[PDB]
Design a protein around this ligand. Sequence first.
Ligand SMILES: [Mg+2]
Ligand SMILES: [Mg+2]
Ligand SMILES: [Mg+2]
Ligand SMILES: [Mg+2]
Lengths: 378, 375, 378, 375
Amino acid sequence: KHLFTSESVSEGHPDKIADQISDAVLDAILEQDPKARVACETYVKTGMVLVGGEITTSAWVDIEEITRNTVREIGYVHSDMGFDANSCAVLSAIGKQSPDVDRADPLEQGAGDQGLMFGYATNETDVLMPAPITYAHRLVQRQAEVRKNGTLPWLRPDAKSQVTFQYDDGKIVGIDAVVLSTQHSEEIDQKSLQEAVMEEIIKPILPAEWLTSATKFFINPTGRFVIGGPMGDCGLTGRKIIVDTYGGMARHGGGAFSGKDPSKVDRSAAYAARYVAKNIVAAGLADRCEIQVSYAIGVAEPTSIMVETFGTEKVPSEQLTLLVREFFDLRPYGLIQMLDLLHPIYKETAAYGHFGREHFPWEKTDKAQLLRDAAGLK
Amino acid sequence: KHLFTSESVSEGHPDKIADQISDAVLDAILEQDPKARVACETYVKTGMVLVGGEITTSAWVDIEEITRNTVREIGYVHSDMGFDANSCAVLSAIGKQSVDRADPLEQGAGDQGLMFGYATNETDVLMPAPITYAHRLVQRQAEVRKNGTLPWLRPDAKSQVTFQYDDGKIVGIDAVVLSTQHSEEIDQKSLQEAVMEEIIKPILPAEWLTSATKFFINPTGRFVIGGPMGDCGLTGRKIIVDTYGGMARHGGGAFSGKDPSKVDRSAAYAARYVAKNIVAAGLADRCEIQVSYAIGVAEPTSIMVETFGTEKVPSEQLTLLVREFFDLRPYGLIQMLDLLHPIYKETAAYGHFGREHFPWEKTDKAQLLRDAAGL
Amino acid sequence: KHLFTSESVSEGHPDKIADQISDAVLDAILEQDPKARVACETYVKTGMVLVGGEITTSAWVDIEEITRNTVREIGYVHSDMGFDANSCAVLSAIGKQSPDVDRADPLEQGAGDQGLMFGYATNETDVLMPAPITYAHRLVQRQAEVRKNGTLPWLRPDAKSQVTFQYDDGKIVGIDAVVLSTQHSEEIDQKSLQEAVMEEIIKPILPAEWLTSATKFFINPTGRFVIGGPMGDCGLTGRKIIVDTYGGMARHGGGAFSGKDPSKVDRSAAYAARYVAKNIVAAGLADRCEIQVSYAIGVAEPTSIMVETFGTEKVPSEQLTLLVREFFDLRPYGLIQMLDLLHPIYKETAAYGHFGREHFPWEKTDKAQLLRDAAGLK
Amino acid sequence: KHLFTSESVSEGHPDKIADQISDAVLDAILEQDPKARVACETYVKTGMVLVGGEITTSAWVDIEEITRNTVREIGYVHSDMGFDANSCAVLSAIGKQSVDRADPLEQGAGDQGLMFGYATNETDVLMPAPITYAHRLVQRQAEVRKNGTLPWLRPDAKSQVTFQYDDGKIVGIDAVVLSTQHSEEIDQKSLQEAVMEEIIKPILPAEWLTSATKFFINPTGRFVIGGPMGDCGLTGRKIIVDTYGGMARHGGGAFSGKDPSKVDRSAAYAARYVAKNIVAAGLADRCEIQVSYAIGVAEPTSIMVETFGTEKVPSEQLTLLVREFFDLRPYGLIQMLDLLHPIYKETAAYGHFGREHFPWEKTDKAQLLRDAAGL
Ligand SMILES: [Mg+2]
Ligand SMILES: [Mg+2]
Ligand SMILES: [Mg+2]
Ligand SMILES: [Mg+2]
């Protein structure tokens, strides 16, 4: 009764490979040119990586070297896994300055595109993130954690996890269903896999107080999982946008993050929307907070700002919407200054979630105390 | 009071070109082989279309002809438009991906995943107003482009509508954005007036248009370079304009290029089918259905019914009626909606949800649901 | 004094890989549709095979399956060699009927393109082929022979050989220089390689009566040769046309063979030119014979026929040119009937030479006795 | 009596587009880095250009801009022509391939291979007549295309000339083939007359044109679809039209896309340099030079001089003079011909041999060779 489900994928999933390659290229460019315009779309298939899009930068980068290193760190170094970073093909289809100061104050620059973006936060977890997506992320990051340190050496990078939570009036009741399918080598059978996944992955993550005898567990439910990654499966950037955000707990505007420089409101505004939502919840102004911002191309001011507090607000929501508008610069290049986004920090974001990890700029809660006593509280 | 905003793109938008090419390949395979497994990802860039993925089927089909015909119908037929269906490159990287149930209806889900369905009586088609009219703006744009009413504009186009709600009720439209590609023969002033008279005003109801409504028509000026040139399009990059424009939640699954055995597409269609029939039955004003699946499991791992307080009958009675009247098993909803037919290129532009001629948009269960509930 | 040199490459050379893939696709199509028009150009790079061109056929073929099988038979099945047929990328860019009975007698059809083609034959060897290219071919085919039967298991497919012959008035004097560079594994050093190449490759091919103490031998002259094949080296069809023919001993028209159906005069006319030249020499009418034919598009009769007998003719060369014109149908679709070319026999030709192997139709000498007593001899 | 035939293609022929793109990339790298190692293979097809190979250089260069500029200068700038430099796809698959001699001139050959050079006093440029005038026909075609004399014809074009010889002496021209791409505005009759008056007659000497000369002008009719569309072009697929049109033998090495350290290109240029100076010195009427190289060896493994009986001095004296006056070592002929300069896009169409403004076409050794021989 009253259940919610969220899924996640590891860094070896072909979609996440394309996300990591895109942001890897972005980080390389930003390391030389912080003001660069980057729109990098990566296509990864069996034996192939296609890196395309449009960049406008003074930087000079090696797309092949960046791509091979990124796949090499993911762990695809051998043809027995279905993909090898040293022998795969790397093709490039990157165009330059698309024929487009304009503004006396750079912060007043209009948006580069239209679109809608969402941010979310909930005091369910320590990191102000929804439980299902948080623990789904932690399962697949542990699977890579135990593959990379040699604990379970038979694991291969491609993996997917899914956690179904039972809810009762916003109260986290427990876990009703766990799904975890991981790619593996020939050095293990399915019965030893289902037991090793329980002991080395699921147990050090899902709190024992949420697992009962009724919790359905599906570990490699179809059996053998040896062929994976780009082998026999396509990977495109921007095909895991719900995994990259809130696992379905919150709504989405449709924009991908990876391969996009901070001037692309699809990424920066979504990070800022998370920044507002986390600070509103961290300030104690709501238990759950979702905000939507939208933009029109060539318009600096957001065309709409909605603050949704699902009955959890500790102050009228009209007051919340005004607090958002004055304590945060939601203008495109205002986001960049507010979050200090012109740095090569994005290859790390393309993997196990863009949110919930406290060292990102959009995850710091330096505005919570300000919002708290600005709304007159304690 | 609050504002909500949704967007849509024309059939000429690069991401939507990829979606249509992926479903055009799908339709041509289903026409010969209705039980085909197809997972077709399309990548469109300046001068080329890359059609890839995994396909296992007994159908023989010409990817080049399908791709060229699709782009041709979309409208890119000249180098002056930035893309030409008769001279672009078409590369294929399609592979063949490498009998368990006595009843095919009991087959387990091909993959895990969560899907959402939504419905709301804001509009006649039981869809959210922002996404609905965002679709009708870009669809009207293509309409007046193809019938020669405005011959000077080009396929690539984007729309965005900002609605104002007073706690569930539509009060009007706050902001309208329409950006359309065009040729050199037209100036921006005559362009703005033409899309205001032929595109915007015939689509948005005059009751929602006030003097405070903002109209952004080609806000940055000339829009000559468009489509696959200057940008880049990939299948499944418009999943929110495909569904409910952000009004409802989304599981993360793309639609185009996937046969009905993929729960990412099929279960979302079914989730819309149940949500729409619930709202059409008067059981709720707004309704969101969440379905979750586990790979190898036929029964959904979760079925959530959220009615946002608009529940006209008890919520437990709603979740029960969903299980009674709807078969949400992977191959059960294929038979419930008759999905093994080439009918998917139509869905790849202007929204998968909202057009009553689709199987998941039929309300043939509405009177049944209303009877089993009371009145 | 008076030296001549010719080179050859093995079936693992990236250029020969593209030739084999092209003809493999051609054979597959001809096996279903003998009348098919095929123009298949293959591009093979690290981790990638691109198969393009124009085909017009009722056949339905699997380009990916044909490509992987062809590379699999060549021996690239592992990423340690630099290329794997199971995990590489296969892309296709094949167009259909390019918008082009026409003739009451099909044999009178005009040529599909212009161009020039050469054929050659010399009684130096048993197979009426020049010695240098023949023995250069035999060296690299032996290298694959000893790699495939497990004799020298450390060999990798990519290999190149080159033989310099000393001549004295057409008399084969001996061998002055041998070059043989073969790709190898880590299971051998360079000194053991240079000795094993001598014992297992060079010795059972080059006759001992042609090797002196002055014969320069260059076996892996640069040393270690571990990275090869498509890895770090491009391969295109039609980039080994001199290896495919007479090793430079004879002239060439410029046309590639592989991937072209027999209606393409670049291939069929060259095979027929070899057919004429071999029969002229086999009939005893000349010791060395080179013929050139040329075509104009839409013209059935060759625009020119030259019979060059380098002072070796046993009958006036004017008479030879007339004998050629009446004992051979050099019209495009006359070649096809004369040589019975509408069969899938071409994947075998894309490797160690299109000539010199007696089981090919253009290599049979069923017209020699006819030419001999037609010119009035014995 | 005998007939000999050679062919040539225009700068718009698909194989030649690939050769020019490969050398345009080469020229732009040499302009910044003269000692760069580049091996650039280009693949042109309907709507796309794939530029691949192995390159190690300190130069930063824009493959897209170089490719688009090259095709643009070639003439494909509209979809009606079948290819457009401003909207085609440009993919790059270039890698970096993964200090031994005290004197750089003593470096060993980067690869094995045999190369041929040729020269004959049949023409003023000391080239075989069939290939020479085959080049001048397609070059005249582009000439009258670009200066607006005939604006209706398009870049793709092929020529072929059949010469008749009476044992070494030119007697005339037997057959002329000229096929040129064109637009729809022109009919085949007016096309045949126009290329006869503006292309063929201004190029082929009237002494060689009789009433028995065959003229095949667009022999199959309309030639509208051309260039990369309908066909397919690869670097190094025109090695015989690049050199001597079949009159001389060929080693098998392609030219375009290769820096001067590649003996396939460099030694062939040098072999032409020696053959031309020998013929220009009056030492022979026809001369063919064969040079062979072993990888890692600086001295050529073979140097053959064939004069076809036209030797005006003893043949042993000729082979000696070649070794005395020419440095045929891999990096020796780079310095002998000053090859480390961006001068190679010019060679990628209309013949590498024949145009006196190239380094390997200079006859600065002719008087020297004649002195050291006698007179
Ligand atoms: Mg995917
Ligand atoms: Mg997009
Ligand atoms: Mg090569
Ligand atoms: Mg060609």
